[PDB]
Structure formats: structure tokens, C-alpha cells
């Protein structure tokens, strides 16, 4: 679920409050379709409502589908709104608050979002962009290490509570670390931008739990997105809720800060692209692939961190462990076990393609098609049988009655399966009661 999907599901008041921040307006405009962007730019200085038919006449007849798609997307985002034009007509006009904030962002004027860091002068303990990115990677790796259950990662208990609220780890036995659920397993194989995006979506869905302003958090996230990497910004001027949210982000490594009292903070490229979620960052220079996939179902890992070791062992039988290399074998047993753990084959295939060693990239297909197809076949063979609990209706003596009952059940939408030739069918346990009552009532009416 992309960012706009969550925005389209918020209340109108939340959208109006968000529109007060110019950065939010810029983000929303940039996330629009091209046609929507053109329309917004057209309506930027239109102080009068636009007749809906007049707006519709601007686009091609063939592109009317995409035109209406953009129109509905804009209406759902509440960028614009319909107005009762005199004579019963329905004009269209942008949100005056949103329009004014957008003009301030673009034309200029207004007040800067935050003061410059020159007020405190140069940073005594300044870092470097590679140092910041490495620190963010270390923090996320520590988070995943805690997700593994290794004793190395001693993280905040509130972080564990957040994960539990996300459902990744269920604390069935208090005191002992929670066991990672199937959804946590699926999350574990997601790409790092996808992991961060999913975690932030869960946090937003649970934003009210900590008594934090969702509008303020979203505005700060957008401001981080449009910030510049390698540049710090003023911590001051923010609410204590935003202060604790920033503390949480620092705990994730998205923003670096040497001390809790420090008034500077360095956003990271992860935070910058965090607003975009999964897409947008098409130039992700990921770490080099260290996984070699041989035709004999053997994986060779040029890694030393336990995190990738656990990721690989999730779906392959470890064989040897060298200081710089791990030799494992992908079997039907291990893949079936991982699927029983809830991991889908596509996740394993995509993960292996992601962490593909440069040597295998020379092959026109990234990975041997035989292995991918074998993994797909193993996944299918796991789910060969189809199970469905239901009730059988088979005492049909009349074809007309069977047809009428089947039509009524399809009207109820409770049909499981139908067989007109044998006049036999199966219904859901929930829909069984209604169909049975209707059958009895029609028997009574007979």
C-alpha cells in the first residue's frame, strides 16, 4: 500500500490540517499523476469555480478513462472540491487553504519551516554522509537482529511492544522473547525500503496509541523527505510528541543524533525516500550480492553477519560455515518447511534475485530458471489439496427447484459450488441457515 492509499483513507479534517504545511502540499502535488499535476497547476490561480463539463472537455476522448482516474484521485485526496455554482451548476475549485499553502511553497513568502543551523554554528562532532548511511544500516541490522532473537541486539522494550502491536512477534510467554509470526516471516524477506515502509504504515495505523498528532508526524516525515542528505536541522520548535517520535526514529537510525540533548539531527537517505515507500527510489545502490546460486541447488554466501545467515537458513540447509563464506543447499525439505512457516516462494525468489552476486548477473537470466521453477513447483505441491468446510444440498428431486434455490443462493452470495447436471451443491455454514430457511418457507408456500 503506497503513501497515497493511506492519505486517501484519512478524514477530511486531517487532510485540511495537513494542507497547512507547505511541505505536505509539495509532497501531495509531486505524488499526483501527470494529468493531475497539470490540472492543479492550471487551477493554481483560478479564484472561480470551474464547470465540471468544461474541465472534462480539456482531455482526449480516448484518455477519458485516465482523466476520470485522476479526477477521482484528486477528489479523494480533497485537493479540490465541488461548489454549488449559481443556476444549479457544479463548479470545481481547489482548497483555498491548500492552494494558498502551495503558492507559499512555490511562489515564496510565508515563514520558513525551521531555522537554519547556522544559529548554533558548525557542529563540534559532525559526521560524514557515508558515516550516516553506515550508521543507519547498522541500526536497521540491529533491529532485524533483535527480530531474529539473537542476544546481541538489546533494544528498547517499547520497540518490542511496537512490533507486537504490528503483530510481528507475539509475546505468548511474558519474560521470554516473543516468537515471530508468519507475517513477521514474510516481512523479514522484504527489501529494506519495503520493510521500513511497512513498519511506518503500521506505526501510522497505530499513531493514536501513543497520543501523538498524526498530522504533525506526517508533516515532519514529508519535511524529512524533502530535506538534504548530509545536512542537519534544528531540533527545537517541535512538540514533545514530535520529540519522542524523533527519538524513535533515531532508535531506528533514520535520523542521526549524537546526544538526546543535541539540537541538530541528520536525516538519512532511508528517511528521505521513506515517504515514497517502495517505489520512487529507482536508483537504489544496494550492497553487492554475495549469494552464488549453482545449478546443483547450492548457495554460497560471501557474508559474515548472522542476519544474512539466518535469512539464508530460513529456506536452505546449512552445510559449512567458513569465516567469509557459508555453504548451504536448497532442498525440497527446507523450502517446504519455509513455506509451512508462511513464506511464499515468490519472496524467496525475489530475495535471491535481489542479493544476486555480480558473477551471476552476467548470465542473461539472473538465476538458473530450473531452480526458480523447482521452488515454484515445491510451493504448488505444498498447496495441492483444496479444503473447504460446507454443507451439502443433494436431496433435489426437481430441476426447477434446484435452479431456483441456486439462483437465490447466488443472490445471497453464499454459494460454494454448484452442479446442475447432478443437481448437487455445497453452501457455506453461514449461508446454510438462510438458504435452509428459504427452502423451508418455499415448501410452506407450496
Amino acid at each position: 500500500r503506497n503513501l497515497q492509499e493511506f492519505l486517501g483513507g484519512l478524514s477530511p479534517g486531517v487532510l485540511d490540517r495537513l494542507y497547512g504545511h507547505p511541505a505536505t502540499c509539495l509532497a501531495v502535488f509531486r505524488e499526483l499523476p501527470s494529468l493531475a499535476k497539470n490540472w492543479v497547476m492550471r487551477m493554481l490561480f483560478l479564484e472561480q469555480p470551474l464547470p465540471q463539463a468544461a474541465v472534462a472537455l480539456w482531455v482526449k476522448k480516448e484518455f477519458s478513462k485516465a482523466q476520470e482516474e485522476s479526477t477521482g484521485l484528486l477528489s479523494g485526496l480533497r485537493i479540490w472540491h465541488t461548489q454549488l455554482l449559481p443556476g444549479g451548476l457544479q463548479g470545481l475549485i481547489l482548497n483555498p487553504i491548500f492552494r494558498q499553502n502551495l503558492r507559499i511553497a512555490l511562489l515564496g513568502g510565508g515563514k520558513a519551516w525551521s531555522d537554519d543551523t547556522s544559529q548554533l554554528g558548525p557542529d563540534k562532532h559532525a559526521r560524514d554522509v557515508p558515516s550516516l548511511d553506515k550508521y543507519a544500516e547498522e541500526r536497521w541490522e540491529v533491529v532485524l537482529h533483535f527480530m531474529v532473537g539473537s542476544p546481541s541486539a538489546a533494544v528498547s522494550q517499547d520497540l518490542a511492544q511496537l512490533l507486537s502491536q504490528a503483530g510481528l512477534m507475539k509475546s505468548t510467554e511474558p519474560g521470554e522473547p516473543p516468537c515471530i509470526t508468519s507475517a513477521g516471516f514474510q516481512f523479514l524477506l522484504l527489501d529494506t525500503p519495503a520493510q521500513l515502509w511497512y513498519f511506518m504504515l503500521q506505526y501510522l495505523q497505530t499513531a493514536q496509541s501513543r497520543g501523538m498528532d498524526l498530522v504533525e508526524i506526517l508533516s515532519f516525515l514529508f519535511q524529512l523527505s524533502f530535506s538534504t542528505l548530509g545536512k542537519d536541522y534544528s531540533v527545537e520548535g517541535m512538540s514533545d510528541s514530535l520529540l519522542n517520535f524523533l527519538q524513535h526514529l533515531r532508535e531506528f537510525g533514520l535520523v542521526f543524533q549524537r546526544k538526546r540533548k543535541s539540537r541538530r539531527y541528520y536525516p538519512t537517505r532511508l528517511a528521505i525516500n521513506l515517504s515514497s515507500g517502495v517505489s520512487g527510489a529507482g536508483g537504489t545502490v544496494h550492497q553487492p550480492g554475495f549469494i552464488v546460486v549453482e545449478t546443483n541447488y547450492r548457495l554460497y554466501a560471501y557474508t559474515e553477519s548472522e542476519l544474512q545467515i539466518a535469512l539464508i537458513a530460513l529456506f536452505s540447509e546449512m552445510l559449512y560455515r567458513f569465516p567469509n563464506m557459508v555453504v548451504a543447499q536448497v532442498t525440497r525439505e527446507s523450502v517446504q518447511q519455509a513455506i509451512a512457516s508462511g513464506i511464499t516462494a515468490q519472496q524467496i525468489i525475489h530475495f535471491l534475485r535481489t542479493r544476486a552476486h555480480p558473477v551471476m548477473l552476467k548470465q542473461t537470466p539472473v538465476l538458473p530458471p530450473t531452480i526458480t521453477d523447482q521452488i515454484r513447483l515445491w510451493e504448488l505441491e505444498r498447496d495441492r489439496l483444496r479444503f473447504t468446510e460446507g454443507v451439502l444440498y443433494n436431496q433435489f428431486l426437481s430441476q426447477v427447484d434446484f435452479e431456483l434455490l441456486l439462483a437465490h443462493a447466488r443472490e445471497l452470495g453464499v454459494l460454494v459450488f454448484e452442479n446442475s447436471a447432478k443437481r448437487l451443491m455445497v453452501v457455506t455454514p453461514a449461508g446454510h441457515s438462510d438458504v435452509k430457511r428459504f427452502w423451508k418457507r418455499q415448501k410452506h408456500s407450496s
Binding site: 490561480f45 483560478l46 479564484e47 472561480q48 470551474l50 472537455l57 503558492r103 511562489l107 515564496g108
Partner: protein, 100 residues
């Protein structure tokens, strides 16, 4: 002319950007009306289906007549310019054939 150049040079020498003065709704309304369907910028509009206005048999016969007249006039222009007395009779015959 140099005085006007100096005037504009001084005028824009002390310049400050403006935002409100860039556009107005009335100017915006005029621009929309010009860009509105049927406006001055939107020259003309819809047209007529010429294909249904003429039968396809008439179109094919028109093609035949076009080819015939084109070849006749091509021979006429090939004869032209008349640089020899023989060409005069040939062009006269060409005109007679065109008339027929």
C-alpha cells in the same frame, strides 16, 4: 532610443520579484475563455464526415478520372514547351482529346 534604454536599465536595475502581480483571476478568467472550447484560440471546431457525403463508387470513378486527366496533362506538359513545329499539332490533339 538611448534615453529609453537608460530608463529601462535604471527601472530594472533596482528590481524586486513579485507574486500577486503575476496574475489575477480576471486575467485568469480571460485566459480560460480564450482557451475555452469555441474560443478565439480554439479555431473552428468539429467538421463533417466527407466519406459518407460521397458514394464509394463515385469516389472510385473520381480516381479513374483523376488518373486519366493526369496522364493526359502529363503528356501535354511533356510536349510543352513547344520547341518544334510538330509539337503544336501534338498539343492541339492533346487538347482535343481532353475536350472529348
Amino acid at each position: 532610443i538611448i534615453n529609453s534604454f537608460q530608463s529601462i536599465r535604471q527601472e530594472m536595475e533596482a528590481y524586486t520579484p513579485k507574486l500577486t502581480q503575476v496574475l489575477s483571476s480576471s486575467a485568469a478568467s480571460s485566459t480560460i475563455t480564450a482557451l475555452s472550447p469555441g474560443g478565439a484560440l480554439m479555431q473552428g471546431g468539429t467538421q463533417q464526415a466527407i466519406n459518407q457525403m460521397v458514394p464509394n463508387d463515385i469516389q472510385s470513378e473520381l480516381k479513374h478520372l483523376y488518373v486519366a486527366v493526369g496522364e493526359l496533362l502529363r503528356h501535354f506538359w511533356s510536349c510543352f514547351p513547344v520547341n518544334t513545329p510538330f509539337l503544336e499539332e501534338k498539343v492541339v490533339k492533346m487538347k482535343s482529346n481532353l475536350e472529348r
